[PDB]
Design an enzyme around this catalytic site. Sequence first.
Site, PDB file in Angstrom:
ATOM      1  N   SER A   1     -20.143   7.882   4.597  1.00 33.64           N
ATOM      2  CA  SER A   1     -20.394   9.307   4.429  1.00 33.64           C
ATOM      3  C   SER A   1     -21.468   9.869   5.381  1.00 33.64           C
ATOM      4  CB  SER A   1     -20.744   9.587   2.971  1.00 33.64           C
ATOM      5  OG  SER A   1     -19.693   9.125   2.130  1.00 33.64           O
TER       6      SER A   1
ATOM      7  N   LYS B   1     -20.517  12.973   7.774  1.00 34.96           N
ATOM      8  CA  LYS B   1     -20.478  14.334   7.258  1.00 34.96           C
ATOM      9  C   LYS B   1     -21.510  15.224   7.945  1.00 34.96           C
ATOM     10  CE  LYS B   1     -18.553  13.208   2.722  1.00 34.96           C
ATOM     11  NZ  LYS B   1     -18.635  11.895   1.991  1.00 34.96           N
TER      12      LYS B   1
ATOM     13  N   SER C   1     -22.638  14.818  -0.942  1.00 36.35           N
ATOM     14  CA  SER C   1     -21.642  13.916  -0.368  1.00 36.35           C
ATOM     15  C   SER C   1     -20.269  14.100  -1.014  1.00 36.35           C
ATOM     16  CB  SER C   1     -22.091  12.457  -0.471  1.00 36.35           C
ATOM     17  OG  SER C   1     -21.416  11.664   0.481  1.00 36.35           O
TER      18      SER C   1
ATOM     19  N   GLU D   1     -11.400  11.580   3.969  1.00 40.94           N
ATOM     20  CA  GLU D   1     -11.907  10.904   2.781  1.00 40.94           C
ATOM     21  C   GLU D   1     -10.742  10.740   1.804  1.00 40.94           C
ATOM     22  OE1 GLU D   1     -14.579   9.381   1.974  1.00 40.94           O
ATOM     23  OE2 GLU D   1     -16.377  10.051   3.062  1.00 40.94           O
TER      24      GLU D   1
ATOM     25  N   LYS E   1     -28.841  11.404   5.275  1.00 40.19           N
ATOM     26  CA  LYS E   1     -27.491  11.353   4.744  1.00 40.19           C
ATOM     27  C   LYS E   1     -27.144   9.884   4.660  1.00 40.19           C
ATOM     28  CE  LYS E   1     -23.849  12.582   2.870  1.00 40.19           C
ATOM     29  NZ  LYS E   1     -24.383  11.925   1.637  1.00 40.19           N
ATOM     30  N   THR E   2     -26.556   9.480   3.546  1.00 37.58           N
ATOM     31  CA  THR E   2     -26.290   8.073   3.316  1.00 37.58           C
ATOM     32  C   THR E   2     -24.798   7.887   3.102  1.00 37.58           C
ATOM     33  OG1 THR E   2     -26.851   8.424   1.018  1.00 37.58           O
ATOM     34  CG2 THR E   2     -28.537   7.542   2.435  1.00 37.58           C
ATOM     35  N   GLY E   3     -24.340   6.678   3.341  1.00 39.02           N
ATOM     36  CA  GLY E   3     -22.939   6.350   3.162  1.00 39.02           C
ATOM     37  C   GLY E   3     -22.764   5.078   2.364  1.00 39.02           C
ATOM     38  N   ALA E   4     -21.718   5.054   1.551  1.00 39.89           N
ATOM     39  CA  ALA E   4     -21.292   3.811   0.932  1.00 39.89           C
ATOM     40  C   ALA E   4     -19.813   3.649   1.242  1.00 39.89           C
ATOM     41  CB  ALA E   4     -21.559   3.788  -0.582  1.00 39.89           C
TER      42      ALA E   4
END
Length: 258
Positions: free
Chosen positions: A42, A45, A102, A138, A206-209
Amino acid sequence: PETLVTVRRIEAQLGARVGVAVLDTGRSWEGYRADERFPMASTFKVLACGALLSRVDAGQEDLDRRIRYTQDELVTYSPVTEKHLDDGMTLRALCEATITTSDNTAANLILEALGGPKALTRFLRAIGDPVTRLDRWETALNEATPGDVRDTTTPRAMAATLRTLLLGDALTPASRQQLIAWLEANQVGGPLLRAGLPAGWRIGDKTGAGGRGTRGIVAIVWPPGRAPLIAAVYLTESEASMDERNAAIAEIGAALVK
């Protein structure tokens, strides 16, 4: 170094591949595996929003343009976009939703505005990024099967790109401060960087998994009385739980403040 030993140890302890890049905005440099590809999850984004803001700046898009959408369009994790099946959302609201929560449908609605994943890649090249690519929507893009180059960045390219967007000249002053404001208002990455981040410092992140153990974070941080620092930290190909994986990205981000 020694921040280098922590990264090497995390790979050896967690069975993970780590990418780290930091950009001091400075005359300093470094990075670990900074030219290897990592699944964006993510963190893309931030890029799709900058892409959409770039079109607004060119008069080609309207932040107040209302997008009305349906429920077969909702993808899993739509914390905001579900509450507005009736009235729709403006593009500005969607951008806020993806950076802040997110929200995955808001992302897809922005990718559709831009013209799809292939079009975000074209913006990225236009602003100087030769490697980063978006290829799916997504949530398919988080699949992250090792060796697949789709939906990837490199820590060097991502740190460079975030600079061109947030502090560079790729975006208008109004667009940068909008993106920065959204990133400062992020809510889903708490412990990865912000938690160990001293008080008085500003962080937008901003973080992603993602699958196969992918965890990522991009951040602009303003230490007290210093030029901002851009950090991109990616972890993938690990079988650790979301817990040991969160604690290693936080442990890498902590080492960076030293």
